[PDB]
Structures are given as C-alpha cells and as structure tokens.
Amino acid sequence: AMEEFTTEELAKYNGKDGEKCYFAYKGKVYDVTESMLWEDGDHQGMHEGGIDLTADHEDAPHDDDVLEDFPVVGTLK
Numbered sequence: 001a002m003e004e005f006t007t008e009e010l011a012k013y014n015g016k017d018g019e020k021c022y023f024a025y026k027g028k029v030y031d032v033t034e035s036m037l038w039e040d041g042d043h044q045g046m047h048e049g050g051i052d053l054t055a056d057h058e059d060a061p062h063d064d065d066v067l068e069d070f071p072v073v074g075t076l077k
C-alpha cells in the first residue's frame with residue numbers, strides 16, 4: 001500500500017511491454033500481473049490494465065471478492 005498514482009501514472013502499468021498490470025478499484029491500485037486471467041494486461045477481451053476499472057466492475061460476471069487475493073500496492077490520487 002506504498003505509493004500514490006495519478007491517472008496518467010497508472011496508465012503506464014497496463015501489463016504490456018515490460019510493465020506490470022495494475023488497475024484501480026474504489027481508490028485502490030491492485031497488482032494482478034500474476035493472474036492467469038490478466039495475461040499481457042488483457043482481461044477476457046474486454047478490459048485492460050492501467051485504468052480505474054470501478055465502473056466496469058458493475059458489468060463483470062463476478063463480485064469484487066475476486067480482488068481479495070491480489071495485493072493493493074497503492075492509491076489512485
């Protein structure tokens with residue numbers, strides 16, 4: 001829970017080109033680089049890392065309990 005990210009900063013961590021795959025959810029920045037469902041920063045052909053995905057989670061076919069297994073590494077501004 002160390003670092004604070006702006007929108008522009010977070011956008012770098014999209015899981016591609018040697019960058020880790022981060023996203024934001026309700027102010028928290030999660031690291032999902034390790035998830036087999038976030039390979040290359042692409043989630044199910046519909047979502048990409050580097051973004052605040054709070055709104056998009058409303059349509060996900062899961063509750064946000066799937067986030068609990070991944071570390072929060074910071075805060076979105």
Ligand code: HEM
Nearest residue numbers: 025035036037044046047053056057059060061062066067
């Ligand atoms: C809207 C389209 C999306 C689809 C179709 C989708 C689909 C899925 C599916 C099918 C699973 C695993 C099966 C299950 O858990 O029921 C999953 C897991 C997961 N989803 Fe999504 N999701 C979407 C959006 C999102 C969003 C917006 C987030 C983050 C805010 C997210 C984060 C995760 C995470 C962290 C996991 C667990 C990954 C793992 O355990 O390795 N998903 N997603």
